[PDB]
Amino acid sequence: VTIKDIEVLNCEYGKNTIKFLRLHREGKKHFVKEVEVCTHLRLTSAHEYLDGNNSFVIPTDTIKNIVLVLAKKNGISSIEQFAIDICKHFMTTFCQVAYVKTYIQEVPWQRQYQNGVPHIHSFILVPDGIRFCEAEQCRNGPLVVCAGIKDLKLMKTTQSGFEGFYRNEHTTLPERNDRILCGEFFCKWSYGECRDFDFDCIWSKVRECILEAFSGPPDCGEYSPSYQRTVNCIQMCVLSRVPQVQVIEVILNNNFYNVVDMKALGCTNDKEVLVPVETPYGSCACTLGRKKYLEAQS
Amino acid sequence: QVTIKDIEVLNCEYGKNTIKFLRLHREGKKHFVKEVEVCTHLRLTSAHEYLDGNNSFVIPTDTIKNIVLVLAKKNGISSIEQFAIDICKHFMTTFCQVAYVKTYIQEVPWQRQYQNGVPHIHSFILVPDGIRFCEAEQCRNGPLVVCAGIKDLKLMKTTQSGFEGFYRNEHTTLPERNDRILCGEFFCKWSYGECRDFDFDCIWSKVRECILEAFSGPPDCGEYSPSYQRTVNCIQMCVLSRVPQVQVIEVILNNNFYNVVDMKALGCTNDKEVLVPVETPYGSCACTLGRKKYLEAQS
Amino acid sequence: MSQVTIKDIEVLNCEYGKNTIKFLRLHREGKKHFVKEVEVCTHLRLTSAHEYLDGNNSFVIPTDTIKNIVLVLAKKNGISSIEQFAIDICKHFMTTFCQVAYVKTYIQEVPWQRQYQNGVPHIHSFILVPDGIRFCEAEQCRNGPLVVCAGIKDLKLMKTTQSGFEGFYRNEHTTLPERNDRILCGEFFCKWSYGECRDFDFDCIWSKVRECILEAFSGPPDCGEYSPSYQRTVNCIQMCVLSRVPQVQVIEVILNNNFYNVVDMKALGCTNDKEVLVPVETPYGSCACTLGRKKYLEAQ
Amino acid sequence: SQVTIKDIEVLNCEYGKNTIKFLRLHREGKKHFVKEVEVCTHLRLTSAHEYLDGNNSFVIPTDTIKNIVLVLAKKNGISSIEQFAIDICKHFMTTFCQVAYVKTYIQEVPWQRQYQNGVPHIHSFILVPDGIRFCEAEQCRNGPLVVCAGIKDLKLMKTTQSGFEGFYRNEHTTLPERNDRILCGEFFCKWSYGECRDFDFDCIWSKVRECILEAFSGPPDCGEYSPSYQRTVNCIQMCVLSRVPQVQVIEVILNNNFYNVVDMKALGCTNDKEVLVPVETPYGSCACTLGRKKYLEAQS
Ligand SMILES: O=c1[nH]c(=O)c2nn[nH]c2[nH]1
Ligand SMILES: O=c1[nH]c(=O)c2nn[nH]c2[nH]1
Ligand SMILES: O=c1[nH]c(=O)c2nn[nH]c2[nH]1
């Protein structure tokens, strides 16, 4: 074996979990954006791996310094714009960069309120689904922006079943038309190259679509015949209501809530006491894209 | 070569940990959930299972789990405090070999979903903005004592915080500061003693409100904190002033310092614009205050 | 709170009916034919709303039945005047159906005129002449008065002078010049109440009110009469009707105007001395006034 | 006997400018945005000297109303027709002390941006009337500024899951009971926000439209049985009130068209609900206004 028999399929490096708070003051009123940033590069050469020559390597320490400098100089209007600014900086500054990817997630600080009055400078951590984004670009290619929400845990106590599935000698699952639907969601969507809109406004709108499609209307809900169908309802709601979304990926990790058999304990459990099964757990995942966007890619 | 005769049993305790279940209640089409994690521990009047390999008096931890689930079905859960009381009372009445029972309960923070201000009949979202818990305990022929609390409560203010005039010595490099970020993860636990005649949910919400308001100060100007320790005291004194049911209050503040990154070498000036949190190592302070009247009554 | 129920909600109004019931009533006196072609709308409010609130139709009179009743009454009673026919329809509903809380009948005439050859009326031939559509309206609530209104709409009148608009309120957004000699062109909606009085010749009084509107609009035929605004012309019409027609208790007049602009033709190398005028159809001005006799208003 | 001003009461005086049509164009670089509207603004003045005395001193010309609408569109832009109607009413109330009352009605021209291969066109539009959006704002001196929004000329049809049975029977009722007809309705829907203006007008208008379509239709896989036009109106209103707390009062008018299964027996074939002929006149109407008890009590 020698270097000549071996092909480099991929080389990538970067700085992970760069944590900082960007503070902005309008007189007495304070605004915060706390983020965690990961920035990864692929270089046009691999001399650092193949030859022990570091000449082209931008230290990961420099990646961190650049992220902090851009936050200071530019501020953070949206994590998407900040991710774009970082990718653009790397592409326009370093000719040895073949590819840049920036991942950002928001720390979910909310302003405190007292009797409906917003506090000028006090905040509470409220994780109701983590906001993230991702920007990436190859040399001479498009800068593509994705946004998402993860660690989003939703549960409805009825309007859920799973019936009429494939049966075989190892299938013991009963048909059910009235279970708890409990899901941890990862949702990620692509804007492609479109960046003419309010990133915060569209992110909020997509989140609203996910919750409403999951839940159905507040007065009656909507029957889910499978986790898979609920994923589809979420994706089709987003695509129907948010033209900026070109491609949407949803992953639902479910937890079954078992109605505990209490016969042997001398009472009847009419869907009163339910025990969650956290492992093993089921998952389903789907990615839908607009035909017109995918054809335009070719 | 040591025998039972050379050795003293100082403590023996056992139990069931992380009993997880959802209690579902339906009022027509409107669904209500209480999902909890329960730990119930017992001390028995004897230690034959340890000393002699004799299990005659041991209540299986499996039976502890069965009892918790049966009581949830039969009684429901009006509040986790009432459920913890019901579990402790059940063990003390039912089993004469129980010397002591302690029940710890924490709520899974499900919130009802709203669409355009309309509450959803049966859909919920997980929102961990401080975990509600309680603890009930009782020794044979002693009082059943109930505590409630909130933990993993993370609060931050961006100003009205300093730490000055502290003790200096040859290993003290900390500068005096009058304008830092105050970021704290709070554990708060309070005792009601034996009083259980009031709305547990209403009082818990009121104590939480006092913690947030005392931490923050008024929304138009805030309030200067001269230390983490003083902020803990302000929280405790606010709760005791506004919530007569609270006899004893413990607060633990785990802080994170946010450093203003020196950017001189990167050719720019950072005027408290970019701050980097230090998560480890981290400072902690803890205080427990009690009402003199309640502590004297204990004697 | 997840949905509203009937308990959180007030029914402010529930009304239904049949609209644009079109028919011709033909009457023959030997060879001589008489026509009355009408368009009828009849609306009911019922004493309950179970059809809306509960999906229960037990008390609902089908709108198809409303149509049948209007056609049957036209056959049985004839149409002496649209007002008497509207009265007959309201009375039928109130006396027949205990579930009717309120009835309103609106009728308009199709404006057929008999053809004339050298002043001789044709026995059976007619021409459509829409020079102001005649209508009426009768309504009654259970245990209340049956009230009759008559009117004329789509009446378009124009005079070429004796019209101005001067001395109006001026402000930074007011560019309108003062004018003392413009075209006054108005499309009129006129509606008047007789209240409960129905002892007179409906056709005769309707014709008299129409005559008053035309004469008050126009002024005397040898000189006319100066109008200082659309609003003043509306008042002159209303005060003429009230002066000459005692049966009219309350009168509503709506004037939708069209301004005729004297085209500036300077750039086209000629002078337009109020010779060529271009109507502005949108946007358009409107004014509306309702006057009532103090005696009638006090009495109710 | 000639009547004088002393015998007569002025019950109502109102005037205004109707059908003010314009397009507001906004450019963000190459990308063009349009809002084309039709505005009517009406005033009641604190005096009626223009009618009673031929004195125009207090009259704001309708031409000035038009100028103000155009000036406000230029200065403010149009984020929503509701905000524009608010801006017009506020301008009149705060500018003219002789104004007792202002009402502004606005409807949108339904321009939609063109798309090619999923790509929105920077500056090209097509007219797509799928229900006309309108709003109405009004205010009396020292009274609340009240905003209403609506959709009209909205024509919806389902081909089954509709009947009308169990209705009141009488000697003039020939309508057969039916459990499987076409339900075809032209809807006028208007709702009041009262004084609440803390929400996104465009977002809530779209949400109310969605409620109307979904309540009319039922779920797309099975639909929902309608036992009357009246019950369908109620389902629409109760869906909107359940889902849209901002709606205080909702009025729905359903004008229906019956589709008759043509009897083709004499033409030698059987028509099994294959060929249906719409009856456009006469036509049935039903109308309901529901209000929240809390809002109506707060008014008194
Ligand atoms: O909705 C469901 N989808 C599945 O794929 C599945 N497998 N077990 N239960 C299930 N429920
Ligand atoms: O508020 C503070 N208390 C302390 O005890 C401390 N120690 N370092 N910084 C500190 N700040
Ligand atoms: O007679 C008129 N009345 C009005 O109110 C008006 N407004 N513009 N022109 C007008 N002329």
Ligand SMILES: O=c1[nH]c(=O)c2nn[nH]c2[nH]1
């Ligand atoms: O649904 C209906 N409502 C009515 O009131 C009616 N009248 N005729 N047909 C009708 N259908």
Ligand SMILES: [Cl-]
């Ligand atoms: Cl808060």
Ligand SMILES: [Cl-]
């Ligand atoms: Cl929510």
Ligand SMILES: [Cl-]
């Ligand atoms: Cl500092």
Ligand SMILES: [Cl-]
């Ligand atoms: Cl005290």
Ligand SMILES: [Cl-]
């Ligand atoms: Cl009723």
Ligand SMILES: [Cl-]
């Ligand atoms: Cl003729």
Ligand SMILES: [Cl-]
């Ligand atoms: Cl002129």
Ligand SMILES: [Cl-]
């Ligand atoms: Cl004439």
Ligand SMILES: [Cl-]
């Ligand atoms: Cl006269």
Ligand SMILES: [Cl-]
């Ligand atoms: Cl006056």
Ligand SMILES: [Cl-]
């Ligand atoms: Cl209101």
Ligand SMILES: [Cl-]
């Ligand atoms: Cl209500």
